[PDB]
Design a protein around this motif. Sequence first.
Motif, mmCIF file in Angstrom:
data_model
loop_
_atom_site.group_PDB
_atom_site.id
_atom_site.type_symbol
_atom_site.label_atom_id
_atom_site.label_comp_id
_atom_site.label_asym_id
_atom_site.label_seq_id
_atom_site.Cartn_x
_atom_site.Cartn_y
_atom_site.Cartn_z
ATOM 1 N N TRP A 1 5.114 -30.714 11.500
ATOM 2 C CA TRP A 1 5.003 -31.794 12.467
ATOM 3 C C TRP A 1 5.657 -31.484 13.814
ATOM 4 O O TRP A 1 5.174 -31.944 14.851
ATOM 5 C CB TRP A 1 5.536 -33.117 11.892
ATOM 6 C CG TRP A 1 4.461 -33.949 11.258
ATOM 7 C CD1 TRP A 1 4.206 -34.079 9.927
ATOM 8 C CD2 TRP A 1 3.483 -34.751 11.935
ATOM 9 N NE1 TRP A 1 3.141 -34.923 9.728
ATOM 10 C CE2 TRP A 1 2.675 -35.349 10.943
ATOM 11 C CE3 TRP A 1 3.215 -35.028 13.281
ATOM 12 C CZ2 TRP A 1 1.616 -36.210 11.252
ATOM 13 C CZ3 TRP A 1 2.155 -35.888 13.591
ATOM 14 C CH2 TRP A 1 1.368 -36.463 12.580
ATOM 15 N N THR B 1 -6.235 -41.748 11.069
ATOM 16 C CA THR B 1 -6.539 -40.395 11.537
ATOM 17 C C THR B 1 -7.323 -39.630 10.456
ATOM 18 O O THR B 1 -8.339 -38.992 10.744
ATOM 19 C CB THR B 1 -5.234 -39.630 11.868
ATOM 20 O OG1 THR B 1 -4.566 -40.267 12.965
ATOM 21 C CG2 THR B 1 -5.512 -38.172 12.218
ATOM 22 N N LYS B 2 -6.852 -39.738 9.215
ATOM 23 C CA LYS B 2 -7.375 -38.975 8.089
ATOM 24 C C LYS B 2 -7.464 -39.869 6.851
ATOM 25 O O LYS B 2 -6.660 -40.790 6.695
ATOM 26 C CB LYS B 2 -6.447 -37.790 7.807
ATOM 27 C CG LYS B 2 -4.997 -38.189 7.549
ATOM 28 C CD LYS B 2 -4.062 -36.998 7.533
ATOM 29 C CE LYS B 2 -2.635 -37.421 7.221
ATOM 30 N NZ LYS B 2 -2.015 -38.233 8.303
ATOM 31 N N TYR C 1 -5.739 -32.093 10.753
ATOM 32 C CA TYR C 1 -5.645 -31.129 9.664
ATOM 33 C C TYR C 1 -7.024 -30.601 9.316
ATOM 34 O O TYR C 1 -7.988 -31.375 9.210
ATOM 35 C CB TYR C 1 -5.035 -31.738 8.399
ATOM 36 C CG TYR C 1 -3.588 -32.138 8.533
ATOM 37 C CD1 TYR C 1 -2.609 -31.203 8.886
ATOM 38 C CD2 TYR C 1 -3.190 -33.449 8.302
ATOM 39 C CE1 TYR C 1 -1.281 -31.573 9.014
ATOM 40 C CE2 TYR C 1 -1.868 -33.823 8.442
ATOM 41 C CZ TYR C 1 -0.923 -32.886 8.790
ATOM 42 O OH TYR C 1 0.379 -33.282 8.918
ATOM 43 N N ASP D 1 -4.808 -28.997 13.652
ATOM 44 C CA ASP D 1 -3.458 -28.783 13.154
ATOM 45 C C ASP D 1 -3.610 -27.868 11.952
ATOM 46 O O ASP D 1 -4.150 -28.286 10.921
ATOM 47 C CB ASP D 1 -2.880 -30.133 12.726
ATOM 48 C CG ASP D 1 -1.388 -30.083 12.454
ATOM 49 O OD1 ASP D 1 -0.828 -28.973 12.424
ATOM 50 O OD2 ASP D 1 -0.769 -31.160 12.277
ATOM 51 N N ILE E 1 -0.010 -42.356 11.803
ATOM 52 C CA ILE E 1 0.926 -41.326 12.322
ATOM 53 C C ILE E 1 1.806 -41.818 13.467
ATOM 54 O O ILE E 1 2.227 -41.054 14.337
ATOM 55 C CB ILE E 1 0.178 -40.056 12.766
ATOM 56 C CG1 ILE E 1 -0.798 -40.345 13.914
ATOM 57 C CG2 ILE E 1 -0.576 -39.465 11.591
ATOM 58 C CD1 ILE E 1 -1.520 -39.109 14.401
ATOM 59 N N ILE F 1 -4.158 -33.817 16.879
ATOM 60 C CA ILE F 1 -4.782 -32.594 16.371
ATOM 61 C C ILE F 1 -4.913 -32.720 14.857
ATOM 62 O O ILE F 1 -3.958 -33.058 14.185
ATOM 63 C CB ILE F 1 -4.026 -31.319 16.808
ATOM 64 C CG1 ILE F 1 -2.540 -31.348 16.420
ATOM 65 C CG2 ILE F 1 -4.145 -31.143 18.324
ATOM 66 C CD1 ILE F 1 -1.844 -30.001 16.563
HETATM 67 C C1 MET Z 1 0.468 -34.085 16.583
HETATM 68 S S1 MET Z 1 -0.898 -35.020 15.892
HETATM 69 C C2 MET Z 1 -1.026 -34.327 14.221
HETATM 70 C C3 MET Z 1 -1.924 -35.140 13.296
HETATM 71 C C4 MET Z 1 -2.037 -34.639 11.841
HETATM 72 N N1 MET Z 1 -2.549 -33.241 11.775
HETATM 73 C C5 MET Z 1 -2.983 -35.559 11.091
HETATM 74 O O1 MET Z 1 -4.134 -35.213 10.759
HETATM 75 O O2 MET Z 1 -2.604 -36.699 10.834
#
Ligand code: MET
Length: 523
Positions: free
Chosen positions: A237, A312-313, A13, A50, A282, A11
């Motif tokens: 988290w 992821t980001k 950010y 998230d 992550i 999920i």
């Molecule tokens: C439980 S997965 C959470 C990922 C987190 N929000 C990110 O962008 O890295």
Amino acid sequence: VEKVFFVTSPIYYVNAAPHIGHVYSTLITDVIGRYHRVKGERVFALTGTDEHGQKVAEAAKQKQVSPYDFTTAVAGEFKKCFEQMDYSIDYFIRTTNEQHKAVVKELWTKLEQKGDIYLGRYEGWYSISDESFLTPQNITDGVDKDGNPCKVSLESGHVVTWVSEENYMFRLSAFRERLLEWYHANPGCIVPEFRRREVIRAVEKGLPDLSVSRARATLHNWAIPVPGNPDHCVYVWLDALTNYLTGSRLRVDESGKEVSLVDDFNELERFPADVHVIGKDILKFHAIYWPAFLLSAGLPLPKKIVAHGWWTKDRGNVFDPVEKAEEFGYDALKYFLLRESGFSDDGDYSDKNMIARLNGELADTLGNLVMRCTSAKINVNGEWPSPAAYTEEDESLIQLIKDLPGTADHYYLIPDIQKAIIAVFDVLRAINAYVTDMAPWKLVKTDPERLRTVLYITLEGVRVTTLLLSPILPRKSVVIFDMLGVPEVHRKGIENFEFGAVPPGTRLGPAVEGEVLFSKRST
Ligand code: MET
């Protein structure tokens, strides 16, 4: 054990608009889900946003707008994006959802009742952008948005800050041996293998206890209050990982809106996840923290965590997913992303290489073959012919086709989607070379009986390869099946992995004056 096959994305950010990294992560989730659906399994695929934390609250502050309005807006953008990407995700969860919050509190209470949470202190480094605690070994010198000297994360180069706070602590140190027992007893649990080895090495060295609450002021009061103590908020988290448990307990209507939270996950037969798709950035949260929480609470562990080579980001150089898809095509873009990258950052993502693959593989290998075996000129009766006797060369090709589903299946289950695409296309290259070899266009005049056989094998080769590619080319597989006139029933199910599932006499679909599956691009 027949359960619902449960596959998740992280999920994301909502501090910033969606970009290619999110699209990539969710694509992998979608593809795995789609493959298990074509096998005729029950599937629940999950994605979302998230939304709590200091990172997100500070981003809304800097846009001079309330967290509630900001998060709702950005969440909307993620949804629009994912809808536009033509995925087949069963649900989109948001950590602001009131049912999710209840699940977080149930989980927290379970951990506390188990004796694994105590009041202590964290005095050490923190990365806000990663929402990650770091030891001094994991920071170094760098610069901020100013250019002033500061400490940055080795993980990610983001600015770190020192935190000294009375926090609730989770007894992670107590879970070292059990986690190790888990990694060894289930050596397929983390993919790819070298990331599995990274995790073991880290846990071998020892684990400190983990801060699972923060003072409410620090989080700008944008988080879930700790049960029985409203001066603390739950670590973003712990909140976030719990989305996997929440989603496993949500009854969703046909519109995709949540309507009910069940008490016990076994009621929906989803939990634990069969596959958590994540980025390399992550890994620790998913392969160390998450299983430790589950062990504490007495919940079952996930089967597989797959960590792909992207972040992821992250981050004048852009790559917009919807913009490339409108230019080059949605299925083609998806194909490219899944074909070009294995478990590594690198991969030629240039327009030059995207065109090379579109033209080389999708147009010249796949599309060429579909048009040829459906053409009026070659398939004069527009039907699946009945094969005459098979030569040894015929049978060598048939064998490749017969073996393909087993091979692609294993790759999908690792999961290694790149290796599955490569397998299918190896078989497509063979089919082409066979066709070149047999020159069926020449056979229409010279040996109509030989043409039947050649044509039948080709059609069935194209059907089987297409079926196995249908998770990667979901719209185009439908167009291909329509052209071949494949009945709906034969477009899924392990029954239809078998050679010869479509009987001779089946009629091809109608044509269109000008009609191309993948049209080539210039350079
Ligand atoms: C439980 S997965 C959470 C990922 C987190 N929000 C990110 O962008 O890295």
